[PDB]
Design a protein around this ligand. Sequence first.
Ligand SMILES: *[C@@H]1O[C@H](CO)[C@@H](O[C@@H]2O[C@H](CO)[C@@H](O[C@@H]3O[C@H](CO)[C@@H](O)[C@H](O[C@H]4O[C@H](CO)[C@@H](O)[C@H](O)[C@@H]4O)[C@@H]3O)[C@H](O)[C@H]2NC(C)=O)[C@H](O)[C@H]1NC(C)=O
Ligand SMILES: *[C@@H]1O[C@H](CO)[C@@H](O[C@@H]2O[C@H](CO)[C@@H](O[C@@H]3O[C@H](CO)[C@@H](O)[C@H](O[C@H]4O[C@H](CO)[C@@H](O)[C@H](O)[C@@H]4O)[C@@H]3O)[C@H](O)[C@H]2NC(C)=O)[C@H](O)[C@H]1NC(C)=O
Ligand SMILES: *[C@@H]1O[C@H](CO)[C@@H](O[C@@H]2O[C@H](CO)[C@@H](O[C@@H]3O[C@H](CO)[C@@H](O)[C@H](O[C@H]4O[C@H](CO)[C@@H](O)[C@H](O)[C@@H]4O)[C@@H]3O)[C@H](O)[C@H]2NC(C)=O)[C@H](O)[C@H]1NC(C)=O
Ligand SMILES: *[C@@H]1O[C@H](CO)[C@@H](O)[C@H](O)[C@H]1NC(C)=O
Ligand SMILES: *[C@@H]1O[C@H](CO)[C@@H](O)[C@H](O)[C@H]1NC(C)=O
Ligand SMILES: *[C@@H]1O[C@H](CO)[C@@H](O)[C@H](O)[C@H]1NC(C)=O
Ligand SMILES: *[C@H]1O[C@H](CO)[C@@H](O)[C@H](O)[C@@H]1O
Ligand SMILES: *[C@H]1O[C@H](CO)[C@@H](O)[C@H](O)[C@@H]1O
Ligand SMILES: *[C@H]1O[C@H](CO)[C@@H](O)[C@H](O)[C@@H]1O
Ligand SMILES: *[C@H]1O[C@H](CO)[C@@H](O)[C@H](O)[C@@H]1O
Ligand SMILES: *[C@H]1O[C@H](CO)[C@@H](O)[C@H](O)[C@@H]1O
Ligand SMILES: *[C@H]1O[C@H](CO)[C@@H](O)[C@H](O)[C@@H]1O
Ligand SMILES: *[C@H]1O[C@H](CO)[C@@H](O)[C@H](O)[C@@H]1O
Ligand SMILES: *[C@H]1O[C@H](CO)[C@@H](O)[C@H](O)[C@@H]1O
Ligand SMILES: [Ca+2]
Ligand SMILES: [Ca+2]
Ligand SMILES: [Ca+2]
Ligand SMILES: [Ca+2]
Ligand SMILES: [Ca+2]
Ligand SMILES: [Ca+2]
Ligand SMILES: [Ca+2]
Ligand SMILES: [Ca+2]
Ligand SMILES: [Ca+2]
Ligand SMILES: [Ca+2]
Ligand SMILES: [Ca+2]
Ligand SMILES: [Ca+2]
Ligand SMILES: [Ca+2]
Ligand SMILES: [Ca+2]
Ligand SMILES: [Ca+2]
Ligand SMILES: [Ca+2]
Ligand SMILES: [Ca+2]
Ligand SMILES: [Ca+2]
Ligand SMILES: [Ca+2]
Ligand SMILES: [Ca+2]
Ligand SMILES: [Ca+2]
Lengths: 438, 443
Amino acid sequence: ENDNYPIFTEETYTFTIFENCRVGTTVGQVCATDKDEPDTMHTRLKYSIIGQVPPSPTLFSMHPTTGVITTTSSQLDRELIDKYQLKIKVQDMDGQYFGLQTTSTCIINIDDVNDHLPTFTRTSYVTSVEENTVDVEILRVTVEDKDLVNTANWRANYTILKGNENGNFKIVTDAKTNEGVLCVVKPLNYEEKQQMILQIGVVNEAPFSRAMSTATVTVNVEDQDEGPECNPPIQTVRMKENAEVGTTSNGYKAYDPETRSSSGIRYKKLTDPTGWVTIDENTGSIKVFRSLDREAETIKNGIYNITVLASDQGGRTCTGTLGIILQDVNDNSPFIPKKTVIICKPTMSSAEIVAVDPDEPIHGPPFDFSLESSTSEVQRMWRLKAINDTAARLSYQNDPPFGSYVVPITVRDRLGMSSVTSLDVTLCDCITENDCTH
Amino acid sequence: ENDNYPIFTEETYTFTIFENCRVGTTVGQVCATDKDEPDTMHTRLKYSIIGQVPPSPTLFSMHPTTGVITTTSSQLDRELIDKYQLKIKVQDMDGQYFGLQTTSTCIINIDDVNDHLPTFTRTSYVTSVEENTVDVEILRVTVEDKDLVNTANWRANYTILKGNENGNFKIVTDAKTNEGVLCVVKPLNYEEKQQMILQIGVVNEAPFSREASPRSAMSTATVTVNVEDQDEGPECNPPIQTVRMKENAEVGTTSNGYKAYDPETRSSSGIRYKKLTDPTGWVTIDENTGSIKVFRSLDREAETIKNGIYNITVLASDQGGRTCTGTLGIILQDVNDNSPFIPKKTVIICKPTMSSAEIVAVDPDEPIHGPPFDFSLESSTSEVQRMWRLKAINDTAARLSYQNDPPFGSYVVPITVRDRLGMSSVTSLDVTLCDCITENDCT
Ligand SMILES: *[C@@H]1O[C@H](CO)[C@@H](O[C@@H]2O[C@H](CO)[C@@H](O[C@@H]3O[C@H](CO)[C@@H](O)[C@H](O[C@H]4O[C@H](CO)[C@@H](O)[C@H](O)[C@@H]4O)[C@@H]3O)[C@H](O)[C@H]2NC(C)=O)[C@H](O)[C@H]1NC(C)=O
Ligand SMILES: *[C@@H]1O[C@H](CO)[C@@H](O[C@@H]2O[C@H](CO)[C@@H](O[C@@H]3O[C@H](CO)[C@@H](O)[C@H](O[C@H]4O[C@H](CO)[C@@H](O)[C@H](O)[C@@H]4O)[C@@H]3O)[C@H](O)[C@H]2NC(C)=O)[C@H](O)[C@H]1NC(C)=O
Ligand SMILES: *[C@@H]1O[C@H](CO)[C@@H](O[C@@H]2O[C@H](CO)[C@@H](O[C@@H]3O[C@H](CO)[C@@H](O)[C@H](O[C@H]4O[C@H](CO)[C@@H](O)[C@H](O)[C@@H]4O)[C@@H]3O)[C@H](O)[C@H]2NC(C)=O)[C@H](O)[C@H]1NC(C)=O
Ligand SMILES: *[C@@H]1O[C@H](CO)[C@@H](O)[C@H](O)[C@H]1NC(C)=O
Ligand SMILES: *[C@@H]1O[C@H](CO)[C@@H](O)[C@H](O)[C@H]1NC(C)=O
Ligand SMILES: *[C@@H]1O[C@H](CO)[C@@H](O)[C@H](O)[C@H]1NC(C)=O
Ligand SMILES: *[C@H]1O[C@H](CO)[C@@H](O)[C@H](O)[C@@H]1O
Ligand SMILES: *[C@H]1O[C@H](CO)[C@@H](O)[C@H](O)[C@@H]1O
Ligand SMILES: *[C@H]1O[C@H](CO)[C@@H](O)[C@H](O)[C@@H]1O
Ligand SMILES: *[C@H]1O[C@H](CO)[C@@H](O)[C@H](O)[C@@H]1O
Ligand SMILES: *[C@H]1O[C@H](CO)[C@@H](O)[C@H](O)[C@@H]1O
Ligand SMILES: *[C@H]1O[C@H](CO)[C@@H](O)[C@H](O)[C@@H]1O
Ligand SMILES: *[C@H]1O[C@H](CO)[C@@H](O)[C@H](O)[C@@H]1O
Ligand SMILES: *[C@H]1O[C@H](CO)[C@@H](O)[C@H](O)[C@@H]1O
Ligand SMILES: [Ca+2]
Ligand SMILES: [Ca+2]
Ligand SMILES: [Ca+2]
Ligand SMILES: [Ca+2]
Ligand SMILES: [Ca+2]
Ligand SMILES: [Ca+2]
Ligand SMILES: [Ca+2]
Ligand SMILES: [Ca+2]
Ligand SMILES: [Ca+2]
Ligand SMILES: [Ca+2]
Ligand SMILES: [Ca+2]
Ligand SMILES: [Ca+2]
Ligand SMILES: [Ca+2]
Ligand SMILES: [Ca+2]
Ligand SMILES: [Ca+2]
Ligand SMILES: [Ca+2]
Ligand SMILES: [Ca+2]
Ligand SMILES: [Ca+2]
Ligand SMILES: [Ca+2]
Ligand SMILES: [Ca+2]
Ligand SMILES: [Ca+2]
């Protein structure tokens, strides 16, 4: 005789399921303990649903033996009905009408899924930002989403779909308010582009379930009155090295980006390693003060560089480099770098002598070597003939003896600029040229 | 049983209204034709609005019968929302649910009115201009105006309210960019005024929205213009300077000449002078000091001089090579060193129609050193003094009469005239007492 009731484990169960879920979705399982004798009618339990709130339609089904609740429809919608309440019944004696019974409450809440795409509150946006500004928000767009707040199905994830080729802008999302903020991350240039059109899009963090919203934003760049710019950063001018003192020339030129004019700009010299020219403060033109020299040792590549400081009346500054190309003038004769030559009597018959002209090639080789300025006594026992455009060979004539001589070699360039250089020639008894102690 | 849908005349209407318009403003009218039996329920049409974008608030209401759209609020703002799109529906059978229906779109654009006053983006401006410069822009001010670009509700219309009394400055508005441009149109002088403060103002071409009650809430801005100093050359102020010098000065006596100064320094150092014009050549200029030195004796009564003032023009120059010209007026203070004189040496008196001639004397010196003159026949023989009388008719006009009976012919009468202080002069006159009639026939 079962003189005992079967009681549900929980007075009020609570389960959770997702909306739009497949039918047959296991919601949860109830169980009941029976103090009576195991494994006989007296403890064989049966489970059922007795009430549902809201009542219709029927959306939940109980299994008679196991006590498992399941959905019967996909018509679960969090945005319409978030919670259902059930009263359940367990009856012993295999569920026969004369079986003992208990009741219990059973809560079912519907959790959210991302089935609403987020949408911009406006179709188009417009903002205006100053040029040469960076790391600032210039616009805030706000979005609509019908899903559950403060969840991955709700909060937005913005992107710039088109228009951000140069990477000037960045869009990010505020966690505090879920609106998107458009930020400038590279400065803009009104003289390059006065207006920039972008297209933004928005999705949630969570992927869509079961056509993304878009909006165009035109950003108008504002012109600010800027100072002088030294473009190009490197300018060059030509000037004859034999230019007369007082002769002027265009110097560095800087212009205003707005006006595109050079007026009002005052110049000033920074670096100058030679100090041949001066700058007119008002015009920026340069005037020769001391004679130029393309072949000077302070010069390299025959180019003479000074740095200049441009400034407008507003007080903003700009620095450039003026390269003064010194046009060559044939004002240097060739010369022989190595003044001492060693000739071996039993293994050599001549030496190689090379010359150099500081001027540019047009005003240098081919060189003509001669012994014109020489005594009658060396010109009988010394020959030279050019082996190429810059070098010649000095051979010994008429059986000369061992000893240190002195040979005056005259070298002249293509245009007749002449130079004589006395060489200390030694005709010792060398063999490898590295053993000549004479 | 009518079996016809009502189709809108236009698939997508388009209307326009002004922002801030009264409620009940007619926006436009939609219509639909029903290709069906006329004048029974089977064709009596009903119109409605089914959607509005943006949705809230409801801003337009349709008339069920006429199809006229009207505004329901004055809260239409072009600067917030410029365009609305709504979907409309027309249904036959008098709008009963079993009535046939079609839909159509209706775009509504908001037109602009001037309800934002333009305002300077800065409250105060400062600029710097070079002196003795003109016809150049010295400042560009920009304004904020939220109204519709390139319209009379937007573009600015500038004025200099105060500070521009001498008319040095001019403001105009740039057509391309709507910023105001401040131009200098009369040159400035750093030595008079180093700084000039003015106040500018701005309005639109169009007046502020009609029912406005702000009086003048017009935007204004102060502009400080700092004049820049130029290193200028010598100034000949006054352009005419004057100096006094005794007419009887000894040769070699010096005196201050023309004086020019630097506008910045107010000093005369470094300035070298040079003579330009001098019609007489009595004085010379010291190139370094500008002082003048007498080279030949002066003469107030010389004919190259007029009004007893002896003028040379001078060229002042500073060490830089820039110039300045002035006029030095040398006052020759008179010294009584001249006796009276006879203007005309031959008088023709008619014996049968006149009894005397008029003889006037002239003293080159100043009035104080001249009349009244005393005429006399002192140096004359006893022989003319019997047949010639003279008495002054006034202080300088005098008369020569014949009292005895002389014969017709040319004589010589020496009239000695002396001045107020006794400088005397004797002058022989060829007086002819021929038998003339009108003074014009005596040979
Ligand atoms: C004023 O400015 C001008 C222009 O910049 C400058 O003229 C240049 O000088 C450089 C040397 O500093 C030259 O560059 C060389 O070119 C040759 C051939 O192209 C190369 O063989 C060189 O290579 C060596 O040096 C390099 C230096 O960067 C190294 O990187 C490299 O590893 C090698 O060691 C070098 O590139 C250049 O040709 C000239 N330009 C002209 C037009 O002649 C001039 O020197 C400046 N004035 C002064 C007084 O400095
Ligand atoms: C006209 O004739 C003269 C006389 O022959 C000639 O002068 C010679 O030019 C050569 C260049 O080919 C010079 O050779 C150099 O010698 C030194 C040591 O002596 C070396 O360090 C040099 O560089 C070496 O480095 C290279 C990089 O690895 C090696 O691969 C290479 O083998 C080089 O050897 C170079 O050898 C020679 O010294 C001069 N002679 C004299 C006396 O100065 C000149 O070139 C001719 N002119 C023309 C236009 O042909
Ligand atoms: C050297 O410079 C000085 C001044 O720098 C100059 O002295 C002036 O010369 C002018 C010559 O035109 C004189 O002008 C005359 O002044 C007398 C006295 O007041 C007047 O009666 C004269 O009247 C005539 O001209 C008038 C002109 O408007 C007519 O309206 C009138 O009807 C008469 O025709 C005439 O104005 C002047 O008086 C002097 N003195 C001054 C200005 O103090 C001097 O003449 C220069 N040297 C030489 C050689 O001229
Ligand atoms: C936002 O979307 C981009 C691609 O659309 C993705 O790479 C990124 O991880 C997303 N951010 C978050 C926080 O989910
Ligand atoms: C400029 O201002 C004046 C005075 O305020 C006004 O009458 C005029 O209409 C404005 N616009 C033009 C184009 O002149
Ligand atoms: C003095 O005499 C002359 C003679 O012509 C006359 O012109 C002048 O008016 C007279 N009166 C005077 C100077 O008061
Ligand atoms: C079982 O429990 C409640 C009381 O807790 C009863 O009122 C009801 O019959 C339920 O089914
Ligand atoms: C759950 O709650 C209901 C009331 O809402 C009770 O009647 C039931 O017995 C269980 O305690
Ligand atoms: C103008 O700009 C340069 C930097 O390029 C500075 O060196 C100068 O002081 C002024 O700021
Ligand atoms: C002149 O000076 C600036 C620094 O003041 C440099 O950065 C520039 O490149 C120019 O050489
Ligand atoms: C009118 O009505 C229907 C419902 O909005 C639309 O599908 C149709 O394209 C037109 O807009
Ligand atoms: C007018 O509006 C839209 C176009 O923007 C249409 O899709 C709609 O059906 C109505 O005809
Ligand atoms: C003096 O002379 C200079 C020229 O040397 C002029 O420029 C100036 O106007 C004044 O006449
Ligand atoms: C010297 O020259 C000036 C012009 O610079 C004249 O104004 C002046 O009258 C004098 O002749
Ligand atoms: Ca039991
Ligand atoms: Ca849903
Ligand atoms: Ca959802
Ligand atoms: Ca969502
Ligand atoms: Ca720029
Ligand atoms: Ca700019
Ligand atoms: Ca500008
Ligand atoms: Ca500028
Ligand atoms: Ca040289
Ligand atoms: Ca050279
Ligand atoms: Ca040469
Ligand atoms: Ca019909
Ligand atoms: Ca407005
Ligand atoms: Ca306005
Ligand atoms: Ca407006
Ligand atoms: Ca001045
Ligand atoms: Ca000055
Ligand atoms: Ca000066
Ligand atoms: Ca005199
Ligand atoms: Ca006198
Ligand atoms: Ca006198």
